């Protein structure tokens with residue numbers, strides 16, 4: 166048997182709408198990540214999807230068939246148990262152009278990524294480009310490009326697009342990233358992709374002694390009908406631990422906290438609570454480390470956590486010092502053009518009084534520009550943000566023709 170452990174790495178799955186991201190995750194994990202009503206109705210990912218799998222290798226078999234996702238080597242002709250390598254997880258992003266803020270929020274949780282490119286669609290589609298650019302900006306450079314749907318193109322067509330893709334990455338940070346052809350739908354060459362994941366998306370070094378920080382992407386009321394008449398189960402908060410570690414019974418706080426009234430004005434009150442339970446997937450643990458999306462059980466009134474109320478928050482230890490800022494200063498750079506549009510228009514300089522959208526960690530916030538300089542802006546936010554380190558990446562978006570468009574990035578200065 167394989168050990169039961171948390172995932173140790175998060176692999177993003179990104180790319181243009183319907184190119185096959187969710188089907189790819191299903192091919193690897195057996196899981197269909199879409200679980201919301203609207204997602205099932207539209208056949209499209211809307212919220213961040215999530216799935217885990219164990220990875221092992223059959224030492225008696227040849228690669229890539231030696232790589233397996235369950236404790237059996239029967240697939241490559243061996244009765245031996247495969248050697249366990251690690252448990253991995255996938256962050257399945259929405260690829261729709263209007264959902265970029267959600268993709269960006271998930272990118273903050275990625276240790277590496279797969280860019281899925283459909284072989285039977287013109288290359289490069291708008292969100293093939295946009296997600297590629299966003300990965301580079303956020304620094305998710307451990308990338309595999311997957312050429313999907315090769316089952317419905319000729320070999321000649323596949324090779325032609327392959328050349329296209331290599332030329333696209335030529336002269337970029339991604340010049341040497343591998344391109345792996347698969348059919349997610351028919352599970353062809355998935356073993357090569359597993360081998361690729363092991364080679365190119367290694368588990369990164371972690372800093373377990375740094376102040377614990379979890380970025381929140383979900384929060385739940387897990388109380389359900391038909392269960393016993395005791396007091397309500399506490400609110401559950403979901404996200405990814407980006408540094409340090411958390412343990413059951415630890416005093417924690419949620420930042421910025423709860424929107425409340427104080428002295429006639431809107432304020433944010435840090436939410437203090439204690440960790441009651443820790444879960445990854447269907448399994449409980451006594452502590453939680455970077456890697457995987459974790460469910461932190463708390464003693465909070467479920468009304469405080471219901472329906473992703475705490476999305477964009479962070480969790481730290483109760484006594485930790487973390488800046489919570491209503492006004493931020495960003496050392497920024499602008500992209501040359503708007504890559505996510507079907508026609509790439511030039512990016513205009515940032516002007517004072519503009520309302521911009523800021524992606525910081527898992528949070529997405531609107532604010533007004535109060536000051537513009539050559540490499541520096543100041544922004545008055547509609548809601549404060551937790552800034553847990555001195556040089557955190559932010560992505561800057563502007564509303565252009567009714568859509569939020571990524572136009573730049575920078576560092577939040579504290």
Ligand SMILES: Nc1nc2c(ncn2[C@@H]2O[C@H](COP(=O)(O)OP(=O)(O)O)[C@@H](O)[C@H]2O)c(=O)[nH]1
Nearest residue numbers: 182183184185186187188313314317348349350
């Ligand atoms: N022919 C073929 N169709 C695929 C493949 N992968 C996905 N699809 C189809 O493409 C459509 C969109 O797939 P989905 O996984 O939801 O793409 P996503 O929007 O990028 O997550 C669905 O009808 C899939 O069945 C493939 O490898 N070959």
Ligand SMILES: Nc1nc2c(ncn2[C@@H]2O[C@H](COP(=O)(O)OP(=O)(O)O)[C@@H](O)[C@H]2O)c(=O)[nH]1
Nearest residue numbers: 385387398401442443444445446447460461462
């Ligand atoms: N830490 C903790 N997590 C929980 C508990 N109950 C549910 N969860 C997690 O909260 C998330 C949402 O809960 P639920 O609506 O029941 O999800 P589902 O049962 O997997 O469809 C899931 O990822 C669960 O793993 C709990 O008692 N403690």
Ligand SMILES: [Cl-]
Nearest residue numbers: 182259260261
């Ligand atoms: Cl999509």
Ligand SMILES: [Mg+2]
Nearest residue numbers: 186187209210
């Ligand atoms: Mg999808």
